[model samples]
Target: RVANCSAPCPQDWIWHGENCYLFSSGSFNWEKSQEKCLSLDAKLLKINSTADLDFIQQAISYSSFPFWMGLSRRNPSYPWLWEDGSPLMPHLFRVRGAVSQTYPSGTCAYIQRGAVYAENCILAAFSICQKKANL
Candidate 1:
C-alpha cells in the first residue's frame, strides 16, 4: 500500500522519516545559514540519532557539496552542542572524521560526503535545515 502524508512538507521542503528537511544550494556561513533557516521557519539540521544520521547520508549520497548543520561548540575545548544548546550525548553512529584533528575558537561543523568536518563559521558552504511535520 502506498500511504501519503496528509499534511505535506512546506513548499520546496522534502519529507524524511517524521520530519521535513530543507537542503540549501546557496552558499552561506554557518551563522548566516541558521539565520536563513530561521527566516524559513526552520533551524539548521540537528542530527539527534543514528536514524537521522543514516537518513542524511542517504540524502547526500548524490551530492558533492558540504552542508552546514546545527551542530557547534562555543570553544575548541568545549563539548559539541546542538543549536538548541543541548550537549551531544555519547553514541555510536556515523560522523567522526576530521572532528578532533582541528578546531578554532569559532569553528563550526559541516557534512561533506557524509563525513563530519570542523570549519570556520565565517566560511561559506551549503546548509541543511529541518523542522517537525505539522502532523
Candidate 2:
C-alpha cells in the first residue's frame, strides 16, 4: 500500500524536506523583502543546513538576480545573525562559496548560485520566503 500525505506547503510554495519555500520573481529591498515573507506568514529564507542550500540553488538556477536571505550584521566587526536573531553557523554557510570573500559593507545577505553574498539593504533583489512544511 502507498502512504499518502497532506499538502506540505501552500499554493505556489515548493516543498523540500520539512519546510516550504517560495522564490519571488519580484525584486525589493531587503527590509521590504523580509516584510513580504512575514505577510505570507513565513520568514525570509534561513538556510539551516547544506540540504537547504542545495534546494535553493537548484530552485533558482534560472534566476538572474541574487535572492535576499535572512542574514545581516550590525557592523563588519560583528558576527552575522539570522532574522530570528539566531547566530549563524559557519560550516553550514561555507558550502555555497568562500564566506569571507564577499563581506558585507552595508548589512544584509543574499544568495547566488549556492553562495552567500552581502549587499546593501537598500538594494533591490529577488527574495526567498520559507516556513515550516506543516504550516
lDDT of 1 by residue, 1-135 (tens): 655765658888888777899999789888889999899888999888787888899999898899998887666567788889897766733335444334443667888887888777778999999999776
Per-model TM-score versus the true fold: 0.83, 0.83
* Clash pairs for candidate 1: none
Name the runs in model 1 displaced over 4 angstroms. Answer: 1-6, 92-105
Worst 10 residues of 2 by lDDT: 95-104
Question: Which tens-of-lDDT digit does each residue in 65-135 have in candidate 2?
Answer: 79999888766567789989999887776423223324444478888876777777778999999999973
